[PDB]
Design a protein around this ligand. Structure first.
Ligand SMILES: NC(=O)c1ccc[n+]([C@@H]2O[C@H](COP(=O)([O-])OP(=O)(O)OC[C@H]3O[C@@H](n4cnc5c(N)ncnc54)[C@H](O)[C@@H]3O)[C@@H](O)[C@H]2O)c1
Lengths: 370, 360
C-alpha cells in the first residue's frame, strides 16, 4: 500500500497534498509514503521534514509508481500517462466542467476520487476540502485587504487624534464570507454582511457583524425576481459609498460569477478603498476585476482579484487539505492495514468516486436514506 | 500672509503628504489659508478634489512656495531651498545633526525652520511628536507585513480538519512601535511575548495580554542574547524595534538564531534604517534565508500606510501650529520661553538656534 505525493506542477501552485504531520497519520493507517523531492518546498516543508515524519524521498517520476496518488490539482496532460492501471488518484477534478479530463483518466484504468465532489452532509465535514479552502480564502482576503489598505483597520486613540475603525462589507456569508467577517471583526472593523439566505442571520450576528436587510412565490423565485435584484443592487450601491473594504464571495462552480458590484458603484467609493473579489476565478463579482491581478481604478480603488488565495497561505492550506485526504483514507481503510476498500454503500465514498476501475461513476445520485 | 503651502514630496518613493482634507479644515480654523500643489496627496489617496472640498486652493508650480508657511514631510532639496522666500516658516523633518550643510543653506534663505524630529519628548508635546506617530504606524504595519508574508493563520481556530494553534510573536523593544506591534498581533489572535530593557514597560506589556519575558554591560548582553536564542526556536514571528539610543542598531538577532527557526517564520526588522537588529537584514528588502525565514527590512513602513501616516503627521503639524497661533488669526508667533517651541525651532529668521540648551 504505497501512497505517492508528487510535486504540484500546475504553474505557480505552492500547496502539497501532505505535510510531515499528515504523513505520520498516513503511516498509522498502514500505508507507506513516498514524497517527490521538492514537493513541500513552497509550503515550507523541506525533504528532511518529510523523512523525519517517516516518508521516503524519491526523484523524477518514481512517485507515480504507487498504489495511491494524493494531489491538490488534477494531473496535467503529460502526467496522465504516468498513471498505472489500478492506481487510486485523489485530487480536485471538477468532473462537470472537464469531460475531456474525465475521458483521459478513464482510459488509464484507475479509480479517481474528486475532492470537489464530497457530499455536503454533516458526517463529511472533516473531509470537505472545498470548505477547508474557503475558510482559508476568507481569512486571507482580509490579510490581502489589510496589506493594500493605506489606513488602520483598527480604531484607536493616539496622541495625534482618534482614528475610526475601517468599515467592511462582506457579500455572501457562506464559508469564505464568515471567515472574512471573523478576521475583519478580530481587527476591530465595523463589519456588515449581506446574504440572500435569511437563516444565516444569527451566525453573522454572533460574529459581531450587522446583517443587512433589503428595502423591498418561493424563496428561489424571490431572489431571482427583478424587484429583489433591484433592492440588492441599491443596497450595495449605498454601502459602497460608506465602507472602506468590500469582500465578495458569490461563486458557484462552472457558472460565470454574478456582477454585483458595478463600475459605477466602485467609482463612488472613497479613494484607497479595497475590494477583494473571491469570485475572480469565475469572472468576479466586481466589473473592474482583472483575475490574477490587482486593478487600481481611476478614483484610486484597489480591486484585488487573485484566484489563488489558499496558495498564498500555502502551509495552512496544505495542512488542512492534507488532513481532509487523511480523513477520506480513514473511511477507505477501516482496519488500518494499507488496503483501500472503495465501498459504494457509504454515501461519501460514492459521492467522491467519479471514476472506478476505468468506468466513470460520476455523477452520484441524490442522497436518499431510510 | 497666513498662507500655508503643501508641496508635493520629491524624495524618491515618498508616498506621504504633510496635510489631509481633514487637517486642512483645521488649518482654516486657525485663521490660515492653504495652497496644495496638485497631486501632493495622490499616493496617500487624497485627490485634488478632496483638498478643494476641504477649502484649499490647488496650485501648479513652485506657486506653492509663495506661502508664508510651508509644511512638508522631508527636508527640502537644493532646488527647493532656492525657492524659499525670506521670512517663510518651514516645518518638516530636518535632522540637523546629520545635515549641517542643509542647515546652512536654509539659514541663508533667512527663514524659520521647525524640525519635527527635534520635538522634546515631554508629555505635553506628545500631540506634536511626529516620531511617535510614525513609530506607532510602523509597529502596526510591521504586523500587517508579517501576516501578508506568513504562510499560516495568525489566528487560532477550530476547524473540521483540525484545531490550528495561534502564531507565536516575540516583539523586541516595547517602546511606541513595539507596543503597536503587540496590539496588532493581539488583534489577529496571536500569542505575544515581549522583551524590553526598561522594566517600567512591564505593566503596559502585561495589560495587553502579552508575556513580559525575564532574563537569567556584558553579563546583561549575553543573557539577553541567550533569551532571544531560546525564543527564536519557539516563535513564528519576531518584530524587532530597538533603535536610536543615539547610534547604529544593536545586533540582537544573529544569523545563528535565524537559522534555528522553523521554516516559514517571519522577522520584521524595524531598525533596518540603522543597519537593523537582525544580522540577515538587507535594508529596503525582504531576504529569505536558506532555511526559509523571511527577514523583512523595509525602511519605509509609514510610507506603506500612507493615508494614516499623512493624517497623524498632518495632525502633529496642526498641533504645532495651535501652539504658534493662539489667536487663530493666521499668525505665527515663536515663544522661546516654551521649551517645546525652543526645541523644535532649529532656525529662527536666518539664525541657527539648534542645538537648544540642555533639558531633562
Ligand atoms: N513623554 C512621553 O509620554 C513619551 C511618549 C513616547 C515616547 N517618549 C520618549 O521618546 C523616546 C524614544 O521613544 P520609544 O519609547 O519608542 O523608544 P525607541 O524607538 O528609541 O526604542 C524602542 C525601545 O526598545 C528599547 N531597547 C533599546 N535597546 C534594547 C535592547 N537591547 N533590547 C530590547 N529593547 C531595547 C528601548 O528601551 C525602547 O523602549 C523615549 O526615551 C521616551 O522617553 C516619551
Amino acid at each position: 500500500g504505497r501512497i505517492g505525493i508528487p510535486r504540484e506542477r500546475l504553474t505557480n501552485e505552492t500547496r502539497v497534498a501532505a505535510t510531515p504531520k499528515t504523513v505520520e497519520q498516513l503511516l498509522k493507517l498502514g500505508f507507506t509514503v513516498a514524497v517527490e523531492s521538492g514537493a513541500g518546498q513552497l509550503a515550507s516543508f523541506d525533504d528532511k521534514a518529510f523523512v523525519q515524519a517517516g516518508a521516503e524521498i524519491v526523484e523524477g517520476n518514481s512517485v507515480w509508481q504507487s498504489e495511491i496518488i494524493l494531489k491538490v490539482n488534477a494531473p496535467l496532460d503529460d502526467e496522465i500517462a504516468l498513471l498505472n492501471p489500478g492506481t487510486t488518484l485523489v485530487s480536485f477534478i471538477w468532473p462537470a466542467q472537464n469531460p475531456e479530463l474525465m475521458q483521459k483518466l478513464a482510459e488509464r484504468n484507475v479509480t479517481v476520487m474528486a475532492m470537489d465532489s464530497v457530499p455536503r452532509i454533516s458526517r463529511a465535514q472533516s473531509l470537505d476540502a472545498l470548505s477547508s479552502m474557503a475558510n482559508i480564502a476568507g481569512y486571507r482576503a482580509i490579510v490581502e485587504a489589510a496589506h493594500e489598505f493605506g489606513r488602520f483597520f483598527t480604531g484607536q486613540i493616539t496622541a495625534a487624534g482618534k482614528v475610526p475603525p475601517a468599515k467592511v462589507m462582506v457579500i455572501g456569508a457562506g464559508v469564505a464570507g464568515l471567515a472574512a467577517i471573523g478576521a475583519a471583526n478580530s481587527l476591530g472593523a465595523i463589519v456588515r454582511a449581506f446574504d440572500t439566505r435569511p437563516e444565516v442571520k444569527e451566525q453573522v450576528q454572533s460574529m459581531g457583524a450587522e446583517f443587512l436587510e433589503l428595502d423591498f412565490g418561493d424563496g428561489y423565485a424571490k431572489v431571482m425576481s427583478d424587484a429583489f435584484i433591484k433592492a440588492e443592487m441599491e443596497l450595495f450601491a449605498a454601502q459602497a459609498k460608506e465602507v472602506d473594504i468590500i469582500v465578495t464571495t458569490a461563486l458557484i462552480p462552472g457558472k460565470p460569477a454574478p456582477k454585483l458590484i458595478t463600475r459605477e458603484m466602485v467609482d463612488s467609493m472613497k479613494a484607497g478603498s479595497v475590494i477583494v473579489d473571491l469570485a475572480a476565478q469565475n469572472g468576479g463579482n466586481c466589473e473592474y476585476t482583472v483575475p490574477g491581478e490587482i486593478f487600481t481604478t481611476e478614483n484610486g480603488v484597489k480591486v484585488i482579484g487573485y484566484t489563488d488565495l489558499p496558495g498564498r497561505l500555502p502551509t495552512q492550506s496544505s495542512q488542512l487539505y492534507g488532513t481532509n485526504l487523511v480523513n477520506l483514507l480513514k473511511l477507505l481503510c477501516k482496519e488500518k492495514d494499507g488496503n483501500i476498500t472503495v465501498d459504494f454503500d457509504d454515501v461519501v465514498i460514492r459521492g467522491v468516486t467519479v471514476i472506478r476501475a476505468g468506468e466513470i461513476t460520476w455523477p452520484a445520485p441524490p442522497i436518499q436514506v431510510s
